[PDB]
Amino acid sequence: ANLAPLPPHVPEHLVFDFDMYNPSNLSAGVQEAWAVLQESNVPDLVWTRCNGGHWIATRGQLIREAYEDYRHFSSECPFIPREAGEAYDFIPTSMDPPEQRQFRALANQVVGMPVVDKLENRIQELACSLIESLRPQGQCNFTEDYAEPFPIRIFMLLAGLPEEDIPHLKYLTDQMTRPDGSMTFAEAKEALYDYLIPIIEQRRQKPGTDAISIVANGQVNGRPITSDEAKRMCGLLLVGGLDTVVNFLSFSMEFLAKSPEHRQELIERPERIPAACEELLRRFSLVADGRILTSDYEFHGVQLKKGDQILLPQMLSGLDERENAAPMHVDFSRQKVSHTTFGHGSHLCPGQHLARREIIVTLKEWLTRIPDFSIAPGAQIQHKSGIVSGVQALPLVWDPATTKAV
Numbered sequence: 104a105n106l107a108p109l110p111p112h113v114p115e116h117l118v119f120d121f122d123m124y125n126p127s128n129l130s131a132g133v134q135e136a137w138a139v140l141q142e143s144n145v146p147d148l149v150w151t152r153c154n155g156g157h158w159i160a161t162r163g164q165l166i167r168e169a170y171e172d173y174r175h176f177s178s179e180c181p182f183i184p185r186e187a188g189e190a191y192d193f194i195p196t197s198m199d200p201p202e203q204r205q206f207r208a209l210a211n212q213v214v215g216m217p218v219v220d221k222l223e224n225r226i227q228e229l230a231c232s233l234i235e236s237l238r239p240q241g242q243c244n245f246t247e248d249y250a251e252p253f254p255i256r257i258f259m260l261l262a263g264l265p266e267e268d269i270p271h272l273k274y275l276t277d278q279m280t281r282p283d284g285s286m287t288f289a290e291a292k293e294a295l296y297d298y299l300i301p302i303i304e305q306r307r308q309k310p311g312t313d314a315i316s317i318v319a320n321g322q323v324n325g326r327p328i329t330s331d332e333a334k335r336m337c338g339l340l341l342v343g344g345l346d347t348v349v350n351f352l353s354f355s356m357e358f359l360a361k362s363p364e365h366r367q368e369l370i371e372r373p374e375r376i377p378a379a380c381e382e383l384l385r386r387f388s389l390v391a392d393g394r395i396l397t398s399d400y401e402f403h404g405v406q407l408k409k410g411d412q413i414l415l416p417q418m419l420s421g422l423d424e425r426e427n428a429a430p431m432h433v434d435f436s437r438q439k440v441s442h443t444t445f446g447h448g449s450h451l452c453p454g455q456h457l458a459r460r461e462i463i464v465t466l467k468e469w470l471t472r473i474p475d476f477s478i479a480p481g482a483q484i485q486h487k488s489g490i491v492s493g494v495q496a497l498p499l500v501w502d503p504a505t506t507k508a509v
């Protein structure tokens with residue numbers, strides 16, 4: 104197929120042609136498809152000839168180790184394929200410490216817990232409002248009726264952007280994580296940057312309370328942040344707010360719709376919701392990006408070459424049986440829930456608190472009003488793989504009579 108010729112320094116015995124954008128066992132579930140990389144005879148570190156050719160760490164131990172060693176594993180070129188990785192200049196993700204820190208502080212300021220607290224009521228209100236509106240219908244296309252609008256509307260509120268632009272922005276964001284082939288990562292990035300620039304210059308004048316104004320008026324390296332730097336950071340924020348929680352919610356709801364027993368557990372023991380959120384985050388982890396070698400380096404007996412790209416699937420750590428016994432089994436009472444769903448190292452997701460709030464509010468408010476629901480009859484759920492994996496569609500059904508209003 105589209106396999107790049109094996110490079111001279113890469114041993115043939117370490118070859119495993121995994122395609123992160125279309126894994127072979129996708130029909131069994133995306134997490135299950137990636138899990139093949141953790142089967143008995145698969146090395147801890149393999150090389151796939153797919154997507155231009157790149158390494159793939161398959162165990163949590165290596166993934167964590169690599170994300171900690173930024174001196175060897177630089178985030179300068181974090182995306183596969185290389186062309187996308189080279190065009191990827193988002194801030195602060197494309198930067199390594201010490202350079203990353205000043206920009207990371209600003210990014211954290213606009214999506215951190217203090218912001219979540221400020222938005223507590225908006226988040227709560229939107230969830231209840233959306234659910235109450237769907238409740239009497241007895242059915243919904245979950246991905247588009249809730250998974251997308253709930254977190255996206257909250258983010259647009261946070262960023263101070265008009266909801267009218269959602270279709271446009273969500274489309275561009277997806278092209279950077281799960282390209283449909285209509286455009287390159289670079290074209291999508293430039294389109295998003297072009298959307299943001301006029302807004303940034305517009306707000307760079309007066310101090311605002313929205314994320315874009317705060318970024319545009321930030322101070323980094325003892326100077327005002329430039330409009331271009333603000334652009335590089337805001338683009339990252341847009342992608343982070345429009346294509347992460349959105350997909351995770353669908354993996355979680357798909358699971359709940361297929362498991363009455365787990366729905367009942369949370370209905371009867373609501374105090375377990377926080378823990379359930381964490382276990383779902385482990386089992387349905389969905390991100391996978393990587394790093395690039397800054398110099399020749401021997402890692403776990405494997406000769407990595409400067410310029411080599413290495414995928415470090417955040418998704419795989421928690422599915423690693425070496426980290427969690429019976430990894431594919433969802434156990435809300437699981438002891439020592441281990442995962443790197445939000446990343447590891449200096450780039451550990453600063454938006455994870457907003458994410459957990461949206462997930463926990465969804466679990467609480469959905470089960471409170473629509474405790475009983477199932478996958479539409481005859482429906483077969485399809486997943487999609489990429490930098491961020493997702494659910495193509497999730498048709499749900501329920502008897503309106505069983506629903507409750509608050």
Ligand code: HEM
Pocket residue numbers: 178181194195196197207210214258339340343344347348351389390392393417444445446447449450451452453454455457458
């Ligand atoms: C379930 C939801 C989420 C998941 C699984 C997730 C996952 C991740 C991961 C794996 C990284 C590190 C990537 C790397 O090391 O290259 C990251 C970075 C980041 N995330 Fe999230 N994220 C989520 C939600 C959010 C939300 C809601 C926002 C925005 C409002 C956000 C904003 C960011 C930002 C700004 C970074 C870059 C941090 C840096 O480079 O220092 N994330 N996220």
Ligand SMILES: CC1(C)[C@@H]2CC[C@@]1(C)C(=O)C2
Pocket residue numbers: 193196280339342343347390391392490491
């Ligand atoms: C890997 C990510 C989840 C992280 C935030 C959005 C994302 C797709 C990036 O480009 C950095």
Ligand SMILES: [K+]
Pocket residue numbers: 109110111112113114115
């Ligand atoms: K070789």
Ligand SMILES: [K+]
Pocket residue numbers: 179180181188189190191192197
């Ligand atoms: K780059």
